[PDB]
From a paper:
We had designed ADDoCoV based on a penton base protomer derived from human adenovirus serotype Ad3, which can efficiently self-assemble into a dodecahedron. An epitope (AH) encompassing 33 amino acids of the ancestral SARS-CoV-2 RBM spanning residues Y505 to Y473 inclusive was introduced into the insertion site of the variable loop (VL) of the protomer. AH containing protomer was produced following our established protocol resulting in highly purified ADDoCoV adopting the dodecahedral structure characteristic of this protein nanoparticle. We determined the cryo-EM structure of ADDoCoV at 2.36 Å resolution, providing near-atomic insights. In a previous X-ray crystallographic study, a central α-helix had been identified, thought to stabilize the adenoviral penton by coordinating a bivalent ion, Ca2+, via glutamate residues. In ADDoCoV, this α-helix seemingly underwent a helix-to-disorder transition and cation coordination was not observed. ADDoCoV contains 60 AH epitopes exposed on the nanoparticle surface in flexible loops, available for antibody binding. We probed the dynamics of ADDoCoV by MD simulations guided by the cryo-EM structure. For about a third of the simulated trajectory, the AH epitope adopted a conformation closely resembling the arrangement observed in the open form of SARS-CoV-2 S, with the RBD in the “up” position, positioned to engage ACE2. We observed virtually identical melting temperatures (~55°C) of ADDomer and ADDoCoV, confirming that, irrespective of AH epitope insertion, the advantageous thermal feature is maintained.
Residue numbers in the entry:
A (entry chain QA): 99 to 147
B (entry chain O), C (entry chain L): 50 to 155, 201 to 341, 385 to 493, 500 to 578
The structure:
Amino acid sequence: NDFTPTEASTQTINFDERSRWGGQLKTIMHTNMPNVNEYMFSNKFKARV
Amino acid sequence: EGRNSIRYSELSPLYDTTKLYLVDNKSADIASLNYQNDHSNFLTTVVQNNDFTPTEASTQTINFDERSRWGGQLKTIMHTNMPNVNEYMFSNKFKARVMVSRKAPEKEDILKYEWFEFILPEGNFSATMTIDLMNNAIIDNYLEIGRQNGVLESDIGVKFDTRNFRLGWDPETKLIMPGVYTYEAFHPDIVLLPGCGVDFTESRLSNLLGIRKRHPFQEGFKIMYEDLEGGNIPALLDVTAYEESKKELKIQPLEKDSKSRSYNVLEDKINTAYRSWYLSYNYGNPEKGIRSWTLLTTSDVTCGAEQVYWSLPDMMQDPVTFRSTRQVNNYPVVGAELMPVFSKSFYNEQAVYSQQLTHVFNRFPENQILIRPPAPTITTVSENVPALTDHGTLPLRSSIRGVQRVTVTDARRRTCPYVYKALGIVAPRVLSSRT
Amino acid sequence: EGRNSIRYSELSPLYDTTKLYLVDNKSADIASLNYQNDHSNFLTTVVQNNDFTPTEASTQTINFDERSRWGGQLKTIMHTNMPNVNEYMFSNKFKARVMVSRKAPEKEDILKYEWFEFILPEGNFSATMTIDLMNNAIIDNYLEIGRQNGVLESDIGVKFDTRNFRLGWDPETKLIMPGVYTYEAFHPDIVLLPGCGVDFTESRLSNLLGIRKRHPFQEGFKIMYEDLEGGNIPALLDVTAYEESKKELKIQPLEKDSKSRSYNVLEDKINTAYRSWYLSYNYGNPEKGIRSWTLLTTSDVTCGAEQVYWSLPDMMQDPVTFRSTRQVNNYPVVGAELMPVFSKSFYNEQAVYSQQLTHVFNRFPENQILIRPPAPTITTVSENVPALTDHGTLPLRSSIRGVQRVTVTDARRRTCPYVYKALGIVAPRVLSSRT
């Protein structure tokens, strides 16, 4: 918060060459989707009558 | 040798020293880069080529040879135009408590009082004209409010003067024997009536008046009538009814000035109700008196010396303890200087006193307390002088972009609008190795 | 290389030179650190961060790399406001022995004498106004005591003048032929009567008067009537009763000034009892006379040049022979300078002499000895000029705390209350190795 995000976009973090680096990744995620919806194709079917 | 090259991107390399120029009035930069800024926060090109527009120059670089540590000697030219009195420096305002609404009961002449916070014009003035404007600022509010209510001309509340009201004070008569006060200027002074006062907090004109505090770092500055113990102005002698016994002694004071204007004489016939700062400072009790917490000094028409800070945050490395940022509020500092402001003095013969027309700065010519103050024989005025300054050598950045930001700030970290010239010259040299 | 790093406690290290600033008007320091001190003994932060309060900064450190010896070039800015006449510098007092109680016997008019130690007001004045105030200081005590007893106006005892009382002195008449003394100023002068004297010990106004000692380092300075052998002022000619024989010679002196005031003429008719310093210095016996132990010099309106001492006892190492201490009485000295005080001169045409009203500085206008002195054609006045000073390079301490003490002192090791600006800049560089 001395820098705006635009200004931050030009900045860099530099991991020392002469070494190969790796990163362990952890994630948190939380959803809200309903059972029946159009996105997942779960509100339609066909029938001959 | 070897670790001393200076390389532009397509031209012959130089070696071991050059110059860099930071001028502010190149046409191409006037047109494109600088449209919404001023001479104190500007943006210039370090490339002098005119094969390239400044936009194109912004992508170019000057490269000082790694394997060496470089430093730059900095010289500056600066010229200003600021007036003595202005709003930017808080030098055109002050506060005062005065009287309003002198009406009779329904004991004797109940009175109301309040503060008003006056303002005066803007310009570059001597230290005599300033006093006159400060008096007119009060007379105008008098004509605005107190004239239409029941306040009189003999009871105003505040005046600024230059006289010593104790010369000619035989200590058997206990009065002013010539029947008139001395028309000579010694040092400026405040005079007050009961229930009134002055406040120079968030102001600067106290330095012009030569009044200062013994502990400047506390809160602020306020003088009231109840702090001037010992500064009562003595009354005059009644010379008009004096020769009638001298042609067996008639020693009474005066009361009026031939215009039905009271002198605020007290129940006794030795002194008046007007108090004064100079008298209480010189003649009153030094322990239990205002001398214990105030101080007499010379008048400074410049209204205080103040410093400036230079910043070049794309060429120089940040000095110790400074953070890197991109806010104009706090860039890093590469040099400090004083405002190029100086007092100059002049002799004022005048050979003529008490000229009297109805001049606006002498509205009350008959009264010896409300008369226009006398002028000093030494006049003082502020002037701007161009400043040539060497700031020493600072470390440089290894790579230098073609477009640079130049900034000048005041103590409170605000850009000064009264800079209209700012030139910069930088001379790089090797300082050490990194091998 | 390697032994050239500059490390703050959490930020990128610099190398081989930086700057440090020592300003006195940062808001956070005004509020907290500096509440009971002034601009000459103040306390400031060397950290410019505003993530930290100054209290928090006091625990932080700047660390200059051990394995090297560092030194700092010091530059200073300073601006003052002190008046010419003041109590701080012992420039508003002097002593004089005068006469009181002229009563007849019960042989001729027994007389008493004593010392009084006068005082005069405070302000910044020219060298003419100062003389007038010094005269009024004596006239006031006259009106206080001697007027009510039997002392007359023709026998005061002391006066300060500027005239040469020997022009127009035909050595056949042995008197002043024009019947009047020359109204031109040459150099200031003391005039005395018997039994009276002046003492400028523990005072400074002797330098304003241009009178000095040939051996200044002894005890003090005292002039008495019995040391002015040869300075008797000649009497005037009686022109009033001169044309009665010239229309056979009438050459008598005058006795009165048309106001029943004796000239203190002696038994002979060639000279008076008033003595004078200038006459005894120029016309008397140079061996057995006051010229043997006094000296004539120019007037110095500044009342003497005096030096100041800077101290920074948390940044610099102590120079040789100085002890380490924490008393404001004697800190170590890092720089010496002169008070920024300068005389300025002006021309005074005036084209008008002997104006005569009953002006307070001319109470005795008819008498040619007690008349107001004439003014020089060259006026002189004191002024304050800001001082820019380089003090050289001094050794630094390896570790520097974030809060620093800044002190200015006079010769007698007292803080000057007439400093209202003090800026400091320090530029560290490597001087040697310790490896």
